[PDB]
């Protein structure tokens, strides 16, 4: 029934709609973008001279384009008899691959949705069904794409999670409040999601294997995937399918990239909750699959070995889970979920582990908050004011930097002059940094203070070298300066930039949230954790950091890491993990010997 | 203007070696070896 | 040998290439994506090079023989497409498309009913005149395609080049291929040159060009001998015909359709004797035909085709 | 001088006097007091060692400056008496492994 509909529809190509006819025809994604306008527009959508009555034409066109594409991914053929060889079979996907392009089913994912905001009384205003695009028109693009196209290359399953698959969960995550959950929109999102896309996900859990490069987008995915899963209006289904995406991905994903992740779940699991059954199961399976990489001094060759941060995290959670548990009443699937998850971690922990005299400091466990999971503070640095002697620095800095946006006027075709006019394209400011006047220079000069302030609150040791010395020692216009595009950070000074670049995206979150409470509405896309964002839009963050640390080592100042420790206690046998392990061990058996002799 | 007459009868050969801006020139050396 | 049937699937082989007519997958894009292009393909194997016909007309029925002059539309097997001419194009173009275009089959000859050694339309052959067996050839490659223009009789290793060579046609369409019978009007075309002999109006042969090459400058007929005895009007028979013209044994003159002259020597002195029209012509003007491999007319077609391009390329270059 | 990359990367000049055996290093366009004089019929090879900081590391310019011989010369017998500087096939990189 499926070849005889298929020969027809191409035997009349006039039921493709006029997009497709294939003569003058602009595409799938033109057409969605066309619909777009005309939802947007009153007078094309609606009669113009009864809500039933009336008729959105823009979501009449969308539906059509939609169901076509789902009855055409319906008709192609099973794998089963692809993989037989059936020529007839091939036959139709090569049919139904030149029919519909790859590109246009990406693009039409591609295109985002329209959230509900919330309104100054409190109110939610929200978009309507009957007009507007919604999840189940990219429901059948996505049946689409795994039923004749099929995801079998990592790097096409990789772009198409960077283009449109994860947009939408960021904003089903984002849609996770009080007031909101109940809306049409985050209910359409939720169902598209839980039945098209994480099992899509879950399908092509293998080509997650070897995704080094993309370290920050596998990352990003698990913490939007978990930050759904703890959402209220989720169904018993949605729960379960995501449970098993999460737990599919995880064990093909590799130890290393899972920290992040394990940083929220040693702060979630010890409340011992509901919510915390799938991650109990998630810790057991990592921690029975990945257990060479911890015991073991070499671990795994290729993987590579722990970092003793993360050793630290995983002793933090199986003391937490300890002493929750046994606290906690009896509860008889609780127990019988956490058990296995004990188990795991203490064989997972290397018996002579040396637990850090150097304990960690200045987590931003703040940050990751209980309440909103979210809260951005930065280090306030306005009591710390900044030495003398790194005036010179921030000078050149100042020039440097007016020198690269006189690089950028010059190259966008703005010319000097004496009047300042906006229109004309006419900039009296292209004169250079020594002639800029001093709040021309401090408009450059203040987030150079702002930042290496920041770096003193840290308690950095900043330094200048003899060598340093004798660079100042030695002592309109063409801008010609230096170009650090191939200078290069070691990996302390990388690590070092991004934690920076972490407070800078802080500095900016608590600014445009305070702009939202200001406006009352309108939550902006990217207000998620640093570790949530992409590489595209961590990019002009991290670059900063990478360019004033640059300027730092160019210069020949030196920046390191001011705190030390004041004895490394390592002959101490006490604080082992098997020796407090053991010790708790007796304690408990010894209360119940006393418990039972009354 | 370089003698040519200089040039056809001299025996000194140059070759120039640029270190691009960003790798440090304490761990670069540059010279003749055997 | 077995009798085409409607809804078959048929083979075509370019007769002088030798691969087979496809679906060639990958468009041009005229402006329609789901258009295919069609050209041709050296393997047999897959289902692209194989092609259905279908009744163009309620009168036919499938499993009926198809006759010679039908109607017919053709449906690739691979892509289920349409042999379609693009009409909305500024140049009119073939391609596989989902619309639909009547063809038409017309008979060229049939192998099996042509008799060996008897001259039949489009072959390449040698005008072999005289006994000193001097050819009709055009000057050497010289480069200067402007005096590749004149028409002369040339005796030696020219007998055995690729510039004596002619391509009979015949001024049919259908049956174009049937046998070349006494008084039928034909043009004669330089392989190497591709240029179609012609007379002028001064009474001299010249090579001109394809566009500007007319019928009543460009016709000929083969006469059994000298007399007046006019030809007349002899209406075409729709079949291979009877072979009336032999390779070698056979003695033709070449007269103009229009004028009448008769083409003779210049009588005056490798020998590089000139080729004139003349209305009385010499006692001796008869020519010998003798066939040409298969593999020389291709190498020929060849040369021509790619000194063509490499021309156009160096003038390219050139501006 | 100091500062001498920043602003452009440093152009190491190698000067060698095959008639006297003068090795005479010019950086930024300032003839460096670190000299050599080698024994007559010595063959030196041009060479740069090297720990990367960075993924491009330095260049190998073949270029000629005021009254010295481009280095084609005194390598290419051929080239004996050719002032433009030339980079033949035969000239390549090798490594010590």
Redesign the interface.
């Known amino acids: 029934n499926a070849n005889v509909v298929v020969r027809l529809l191409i035997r009349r190509p006039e039921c493709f709609g006029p997009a497709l006819r294939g003569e003058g025809g602009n595409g799938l994604l033109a057409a969605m973008e066309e619909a777009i306008k005309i939802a947007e527009d009153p007078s094309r959508d609606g009669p113009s001279p009864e809500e039933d009555d009336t008729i959105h034409m823009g979501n009449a066109i969308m539906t059509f384009y939609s169901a076509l594409i789902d009855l055409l991914g319906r008709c192609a053929p099973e794998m089963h008899l692809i993989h037989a060889g059936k020529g007839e079979a091939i036959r139709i996907r090569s049919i139904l691959r030149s029919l519909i392009p790859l590109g246009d089913l990406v693009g039409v994912i591609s295109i985002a949705f329209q959230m509900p905001t919330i309104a100054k009384d409190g109110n939610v205003v929200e978009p309507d069904m009957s007009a507007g695009f919604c999840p189940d028109h990219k429901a059948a693009m996505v049946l689409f794409l795994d039923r004749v196209y099929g995801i079998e290359v990592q790097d096409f399953l990789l772009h198409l999670l960077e283009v449109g698959f994860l947009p939408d969960l960021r904003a089903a995550a984002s849609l996770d409040t009080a007031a909101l959950s109940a809306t049409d929109m985050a209910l359409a999102l939720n169902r598209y999601l839980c039945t098209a896309v994480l099992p899509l996900l879950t399908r092509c859990a293998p080509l997650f294997a070897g995704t080094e490069h993309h370290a920050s987008l596998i990352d990003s995915l698990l913490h939007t995937v978990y930050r759904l899963s703890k959402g209220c209006s989720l169904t018993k289904a949605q729960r379960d399918s995501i449970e098993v995406c999460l737990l599919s991905i995880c064990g093909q994903l590799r130890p290393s990239m899972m920290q992040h992740l394990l940083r929220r779940l040693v702060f979630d699991v010890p409340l011992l909750n509901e919510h915390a059954k799938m991650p109990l199961k998630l810790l057991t399976n990592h921690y029975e699959r990945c257990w060479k990489y911890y015991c073991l001094p070499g671990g795994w060759g290729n993987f590579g070995a722990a970092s003793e941060e993360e050793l630290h995290l995983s002793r933090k959670l199986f003391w937490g889970i300890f002493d929750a548990l046994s606290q906690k009443k009896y509860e008889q699937e609780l127990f019988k979920l956490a058990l296995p998850c004990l188990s795991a971690v203490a064989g997972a922990l290397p018996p002579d582990y040396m637990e850090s005299n150097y304990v960690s400091m200045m987590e931003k466990q703040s940050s990751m908050d209980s309440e909103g999971n979210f809260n951005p503070q930065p280090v306030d640095t306005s009591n710390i004011t900044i030495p003398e002697k790194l005036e010179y620095f921030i000078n050149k800095y100042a020039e440097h930097s007016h020198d690269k946006w006189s690089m950028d006027k010059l190259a966008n075709g703005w010319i000097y002059g004496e009047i300042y006019s906006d229109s004309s394209k006419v900039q009296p400011l292209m004169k250079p940094y020594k002639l800029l006047s001093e709040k021309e220079k401090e408009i450059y000069r203040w987030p150079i203070k702002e930042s290496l302030k920041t770096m003193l609150a840290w308690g950095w040791r900043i330094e200048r070298t003899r060598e340093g010395d004798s660079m100042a020692l030695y002592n309109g216009y063409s801008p010609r300066a230096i170009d650090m595009s191939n200078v290069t950070l070691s990996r302390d000074l990388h690590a070092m930039a991004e934690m920076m670049a972490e407070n800078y995206h802080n500095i900016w979150a608590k600014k445009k949230k305070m702009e939202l409470e200001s406006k009352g509405g309108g939550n902006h896309p990217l207000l998620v954790p640093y570790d949530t964002l992409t590489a595209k839009e961590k990019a002009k963050d991290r670059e900063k950091a990478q360019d004033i640390l640059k300027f730092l080592q160019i210069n020949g100042y030196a920046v390191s890491r001011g705190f030390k420790d004041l004895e490394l206690d390592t002959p101490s046998i006490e604080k082992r993990f098997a020796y407090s392990f053991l010790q708790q061990l007796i304690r408990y058996v010894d209360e119940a010997h006393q418990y039972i002799l009354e | 203007r370089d003698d040519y007459d200089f040039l056809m009868q001299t025996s000194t050969y140059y070759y120039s070696v640029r270190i691009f801006p960003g790798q440090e020139p304490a761990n670069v050396w540059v010279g003749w070896i055997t | 040998h077995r009798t085409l049937l409607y809804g078959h699937a048929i083979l075509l082989r370019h007769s002088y290439s030798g691969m087979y007519l496809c679906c060639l997958s990958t468009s041009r894009s005229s402006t329609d994506k789901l258009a295919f292009d069609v050209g041709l393909q050296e393997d047999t194997t897959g289902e692209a090079c194989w092609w259905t016909i279908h009744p163009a007309s309620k009168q036919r029925s499938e499993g009926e023989k198809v006759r010679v002059g039908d109607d017919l539309i053709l449906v690739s097997v691979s892509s289920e497409r349409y042999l379609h001419l693009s009409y909305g194009n500024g140049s009119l173009h073939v391609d596989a498309a989902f619309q639909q275009t009547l063809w038409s089959v017309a008979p060229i000859s049939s192998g099996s009913e042509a008799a060996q050694g008897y001259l039949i339309g489009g072959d390449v052959l040698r005008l072999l005149h005289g006994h000193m067996d001097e050819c009709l050839t055009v000057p050497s490659g010289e480069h200067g395609e402007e005096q590749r223009r004149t028409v002369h009789y040339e005796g030696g290793a020219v007998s055995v080049h690729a510039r004596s060579l002619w391509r009979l046609e015949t001024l049919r369409v259908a049956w174009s291929g049937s046998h070349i019978r006494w008084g039928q009007p034909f043009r004669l075309r330089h392989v190497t040159t591709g240029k179609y002999l012609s007379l002028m109006e001064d009474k001299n042969l010249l090579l001109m060009d394809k566009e500007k090459a007319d019928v009543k400058s460009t016709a000929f007929t083969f006469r059994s001998s000298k007399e007046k005895l006019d030809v007349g009007v002899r209406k075409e028979v729709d079949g291979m015909g009877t072979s009336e013209i032999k390779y070698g044994d056979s003695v033709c003159y070449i007269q103009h359709v229009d004028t009448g002259l008769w083409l003779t020597y210049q009588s005056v002195d490798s020998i590089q004797r000139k080729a004139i029209m003349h209305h009385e012509g010499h006692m001796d003007d008869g020519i010998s035909l003798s066939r040409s491999q298969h593999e020389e007319s291709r190498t020929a077609r060849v040369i021509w085709s790619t000194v063509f391009l490499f021309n156009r390329f160096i003038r390219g270059l050139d501006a | 001088?100091?500062?001498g990359?920043?602003?452009?990367?440093?152009?190491?000049?190698?000067?060698?006097?095959?008639?006297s055996g003068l090795?005479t290093?010019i950086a930024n366009g300032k003839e460096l007091s670190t000299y050599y004089q080698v024994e007559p019929s010595?063959?030196?090879?041009?060479?740069?060692?090297?720990?990367?900081?960075?993924?491009?590391?330095?260049?190998?310019?073949?270029?000629?400056?005021?009254?010295?011989?481009?280095?084609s010369?005194?390598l290419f017998k051929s080239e004996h008496?050719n002032?433009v500087p030339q980079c033949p096939p035969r000239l390549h990189v090798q490594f010590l492994s």
Do not use: W
């Open positions: 001088p100091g500062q990359r920043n602003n452009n990367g440093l152009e190491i000049g190698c000067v060698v006097d095959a008639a090795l290093f010595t063959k030196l090879f041009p060479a740069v060692f090297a720990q990367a900081t960075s993924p491009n590391v330095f260049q190998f310019e073949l270029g000629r400056i005021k009254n010295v011989m481009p280095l010369a005194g008496k002032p």
